[PDB]
């Protein structure tokens, strides 16, 4: 896919180095449009950074900090849309990218740690925010840059905080450069001016000729002067055409504005017009893919299995909120207080962050660590939206066995813009989420678990959706001793897929099941009960069904399908005792029914409207 979503961490440190690097690589492998932010921090020396060559447009902001690699290739980058800015002031931040200036005495011929020279030959647009460059003890040429050319005329915040201190005598701009403002020493690094050398009123142009003016809806430079020839669409890119609005999906007559579906309808996703919304987002009636349904509009699963927001006539159902969703917005974790709102929540919305305080208490709030026997709140939950943080579990629980019915987690709310799970600080031994069958979006980290197996075995790929998702191993208990001890699935588990030890958890198994365990076989003729097969389920025969091995005991659950009733026949049913009949619809027992010779629950020939005291030897009321 050409569209990914970037991280959101600002200056928080990596969860792990050997995980952070691969996190970047999985997030930006072949991506061309980066929705969300773009963050590069604590990049070690000799970093690959090749996966960045094909990034063209950034929809958030660019952050680079505390780096020791000497060059970060971002040539094909063109436009920085600045949707959400760094510190609400910056859209391109490059700071501290050099040695801490403490000791770090370089040996002979050693390049000191720090970005040698910016190299961005096609970055010629910034739609908002400013530039923040400082504390770069090896950067060159950053001052000889005409930034106001890079900025956009609407970006009135043309505020730059640029520093010039350096410890190396930078080589002069190569003579081929014009204006002596060069990104680098090589001849092709001279800045291309597209905002100081255009015609009168031309925002962008190919060159200093009054026919080089770009169309009114391009971004930076143009191959041709038609709106289909932009290097980057300003507002919407509908099928290679730069338009101002995606075509509406309903036509209204000018008299009644009656809604007639328009086959040429387009939904909006980022700065692009998409015919149908992507997998995880929701299509609303107003015509925009989103994540959270608006007010008085509720999730409804469409006929084709997709989801969409539908209008409510009656008040929409009582959706059981989680955390960080609507009104528990800044609520961090679940105490014993909010947990009570989670009674009868088959579907939850929002995160459930679990800081260690949840299981270590907070004296100021008078909240004890929540009980390991306080988890019954989360038992009928079947769908969570957003992530599911975990950094405290009870030791009495050997795992996260609590959520046996959570069937769907969707990644509509990720932890840092990146993470849909997390398993860090735990001491658990497995998972046991036997019913989690879909994991919408975002990487799932399982981090710093010293007692954990069942991560090299979980059926991953069958849960993810896009190629961009990836799952990251770190500090997890070694698979080598996991196998040696034998923390894997068992034979019935199809394809070696599982979640934890014991035959309980298998996403799939060859033989049948009797409710919570894949079986070796059903008990049809041999077996303590008698069970008939249905959807590979061994439903037990009715107790009245006489267990007659050698013949099919039953053909169903009700009494009618027993091969031969054990005791008596009240046709068409099997009974252990021929019940005393009743005359009316309203309850009244005159007896009036006796078992026959072979079990036919005969009615009593005798009738006693007066309820005669004398009782026939058969049980009938004997007439006085």
């Amino acid at each position, epitope marked *: 896919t050409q569209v990914c979503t970037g991280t959101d961490m600002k200056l928080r440190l990596p969860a792990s180095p050997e995980t952070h690097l691969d996190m970047l690589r999985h997030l930006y492998q072949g991506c061309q449009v980066v929705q969300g932010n773009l963050e590069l921090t604590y990049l070690p020396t000799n970093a690959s950074l090749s996966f960045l060559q094909d990034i063209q447009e950034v929809q958030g902001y660019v952050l680079i900090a505390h780096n020791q690699v000497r060059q970060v290739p971002l040539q094909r980058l063109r436009i920085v849309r600045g949707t959400q800015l760094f510190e609400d002031n910056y859209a391109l931040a490059v700071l501290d990218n050099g040695d801490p200036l403490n000791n770090t005495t370089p040996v002979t011929g050693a390049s000191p740690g720090g970005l040698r020279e910016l190299q961005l030959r096609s970055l010629t647009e910034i739609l908002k925010g400013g530039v923040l460059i400082q504390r770069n003890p090896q950067l060159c040429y950053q001052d000889t840059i005409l930034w106001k050319d890079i900025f956009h005329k609407n970006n009135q915040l043309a505020l730059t905080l640029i520093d010039t201190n350096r410890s190396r005598a930078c080589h002069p701009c190569s003579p081929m450069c014009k204006g002596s403002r060069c990104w680098g020493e090589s001849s092709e690094d001279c800045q291309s001016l597209t905002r100081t050398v255009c015609a009168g009123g031309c925002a962008r142009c190919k060159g200093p000729l009054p026919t080089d003016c770009c169309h009114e809806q391009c971004a930076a430079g143009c191959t041709g002067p038609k709106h289909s020839d932009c290097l980057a669409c300003l507002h919407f890119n509908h099928s290679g055409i730069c338009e101002l609005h995606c075509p509406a999906l309903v036509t209204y007559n000018t008299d009644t504005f009656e809604s007639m579906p328009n086959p040429e309808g387009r939904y909006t996703f980022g700065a692009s017009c998409v015919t149908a919304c992507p997998y995880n987002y929701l299509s609303t009636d107003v015509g925009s893919c989103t994540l959270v349904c608006p007010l008085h509009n509720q999730e409804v699963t469409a006929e084709d299995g997709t989801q969409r927001c539908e209008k409510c006539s009656k008040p929409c159902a009582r959706v059981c909120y989680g955390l960080g969703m609507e009104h528990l917005r800044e609520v961090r974790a679940v105490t014993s207080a909010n947990i009570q709102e989670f009674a009868g929540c088959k579907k939850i919305f929002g995160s459930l962050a679990f800081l260690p305080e949840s299981f270590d208490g907070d004296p100021a709030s008078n909240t004890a660590p929540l009980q390991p026997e306080q988890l019954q709140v989360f038992e009928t939950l079947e769908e969570i939206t957003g992530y599911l943080y975990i950094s405290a579990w009870p030791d009495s629980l050997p795992d996260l066995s609590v959520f046996q019915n959570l069937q769907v987690i969707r990644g509509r709310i990720l932890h840092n813009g990146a993470y849909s799970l997390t398993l860090q600080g735990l001491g658990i031994s497995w998972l046991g989420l036997r019913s989690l069958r879909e994991l919408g979006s975002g990487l799932a980290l399982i981090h710093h678990n010293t007692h954990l197996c069942f991560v090299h075995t979980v059926p991953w790929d069958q849960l993810f959706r896009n190629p961009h998702q990836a799952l990251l191993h770190t500090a997890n208990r070694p698979e080598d001793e996991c196998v040696g001890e034998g923390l894997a699935c068992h034979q019935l588990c199809a394809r070696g897929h599982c979640w934890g030890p014991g035959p309980t958890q298998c996403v799939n198994c060859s033989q049948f099941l009797r409710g919570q365990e894949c079986v070796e076989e059903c008990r049809v003729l041999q077996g303590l009960p008698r069970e008939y097969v249905n959807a590979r389920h061994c439903l037990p025969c009715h107790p009245e069904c006489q267990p007659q091995n050698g013949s099919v005991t039953c053909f169903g*659950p009700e009494a*009618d399908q027993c091969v031969a009733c054990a005791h008596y026949k009240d*046709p*068409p049913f099997c009974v252990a005792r021929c*019940p005393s*009949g*009743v005359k009316p619809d309203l309850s009244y027992m005159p007896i009036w*029914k006796f078992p026959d010779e072979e079990g036919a629950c005969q009615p009593c020939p005798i009738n006693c409207t007066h309820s005669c005291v004398d009782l026939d030897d058969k049980g009938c009321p004997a007439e006085q």
Partner: antibody
Amino acid sequence: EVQLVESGGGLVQPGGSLRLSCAASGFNIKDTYIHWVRQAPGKGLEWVARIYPTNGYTRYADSVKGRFTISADTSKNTAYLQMNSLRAEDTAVYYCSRWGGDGFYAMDYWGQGTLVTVSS
Amino acid sequence: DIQMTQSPSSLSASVGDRVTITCRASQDVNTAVAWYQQKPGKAPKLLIYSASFLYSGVPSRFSGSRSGTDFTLTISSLQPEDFATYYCQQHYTTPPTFGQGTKVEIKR
């Protein structure tokens, strides 16, 4: 009094789907049976489906099996027969019938009948 | 499946006659057979249950006799109301089985 209200009869098209609703009054549906029976025009009647609403057990005749579906709601104290992939021969008078709970399995109380006509 | 072969549906008789309807099961059926009366365009009703017991609201002129697998619905005295389709339904198996109806008209 024990009354059965049958609704949903009307014209239908071949290949379509219809639903019949049987509402019970004067008695609780929680301790009896329900039987949907066709009355074929010009032919003898024909038992179609049985449902036990206490546990919602469903049994269908072989012929109508695969297409028809049944359900019941004890709280609403009624039953529904959702018929799918209607055929031309399905044109008949559908009836909802009850049973005597225990010691009595006669169709003591019948519904009124709703016509289903499939002729395009 | 158990088959019910009914008496021929041609039983034109006048009032007061003893009218007999023959019902025969394909297999053994015990007494699990009940006669239901249904005038066309209406709903049937239990006219005789368990093959031997009259139901409440039924005149005593109606009767039912059992002999092996042969059931005889007997009317001592014919009445104008005794004109409908009569089904000797059996419940002896899971799908209750009916007959072809004995259209009991009136010889007039």
